[PDB]
Every structure is written in structure tokens, then in C-alpha cells.
Write a protein that binds this DNA or RNA. Structure first.
Length: 116
RNA sequence: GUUGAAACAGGGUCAGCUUGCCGUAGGUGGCAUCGCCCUCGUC
């Protein structure tokens, strides 16, 4: 995804090792270090509300990286909709129930698995 | 006899410790059993 100026910016910020060091020397960095599992994200300036992961190329990339990579998986068949719709192992971490986002529907122990 | 099987609520933890129902208060004050009535009549 080149010529974005949002990800070329961060890819030039993630090939820096010093500006990232400058992130620790920020006014409020001491308050993000307090929260375990802080989630930083990359809003390039000159978009002003829009993250690097909000530009209409990363937006399309994700809409392309959730339409190509998450479509070659196990071909069928949906429990929910019944369509072919490639099957999703690893249901996504439903947040707000547990102490951590937990996979609402998740059969992961040696025998909760039914038929192998 | 090819098709959800197997599966714990467990193990256990004094509700204890303790705390006057009390101090205290007239049943009083007061009120006629009265007014009255042949044991008679008589052998």
C-alpha cells in the first residue's frame, strides 16, 4: 500500500528507533505506561481525526485483507447464516463480558471438540 | 452396532465477641343499707 503518506509515514516512524524513543519522552507517556495493554495508534498529522488505520487505503486494505485472506479458509458451511462463507476458526474476542475480551464461541480444550 | 461420548461444586470456614429495660409512679379521692314492717288473729 504505497503512496499513502499515512503508512509510509509510520513505516518511516517504525524504521526510526529514535522517534519511538521520543514517544517514551512524551508529556503523557507516563500515563499510558500506567495502563497495562495500552493500545497506541498512529494518527499522522494533517488528517486530524483519521488514524493511519483510517485512511481510504488502509480502510480498503482491511476491506481487502478481510475479503481475500479471510476467504481462502475452510470453505463452508456457516453455522449462523448457513451460507458457504469460509469458516472462521478463532472467533473474535467478544469484549465487555470477562476481565478480557474472550471468544464468546470458542471450543478450545482437548475435549470440548466434538468430532475432531 | 458408525455417530457427544468423559465431566464435582468441589475441598472448608463458630457469626461471632457482648450489651440493665430501664430508672418510677397514690388507686385513688368518698359514698347511710337504707327509709319501715302487730306475730299475729285464738283455742
Amino acid at each position: 500500500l504505497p503512496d499513502d503518506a499515512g503508512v509510509t509515514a509510520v513505516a518511516a516512524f517504525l524504521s526510526s528507533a529514535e522517534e519511538k524513543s521520543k514517544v517514551m519522552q512524551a508529556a503523557n507517556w507516563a500515563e499510558c505506561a500506567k495502563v497495562k495493554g495500552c493500545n497506541l495508534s498512529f494518527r499522522l498529522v494533517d488528517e486530524a481525526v483519521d488514524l493511519v488505520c483510517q485512511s481510504k487505503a488502509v480502510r480498503e486494505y482491511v476491506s481487502q485483507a478481510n475479503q481475500t485472506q479471510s476467504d481462502n479458509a475452510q470453505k463452508g458451511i456457516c453455522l449462523v447464516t448457513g451460507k458457504a462463507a469460509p469458516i472462521a476458526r478463532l472467533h473474535n474476542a467478544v469484549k465487555g463480558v470477562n476481565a478480557k475480551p474472550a471468544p464468546f464461541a470458542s471450543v478450545n480444550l482437548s475435549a470440548f471438540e466434538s468430532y475432531g
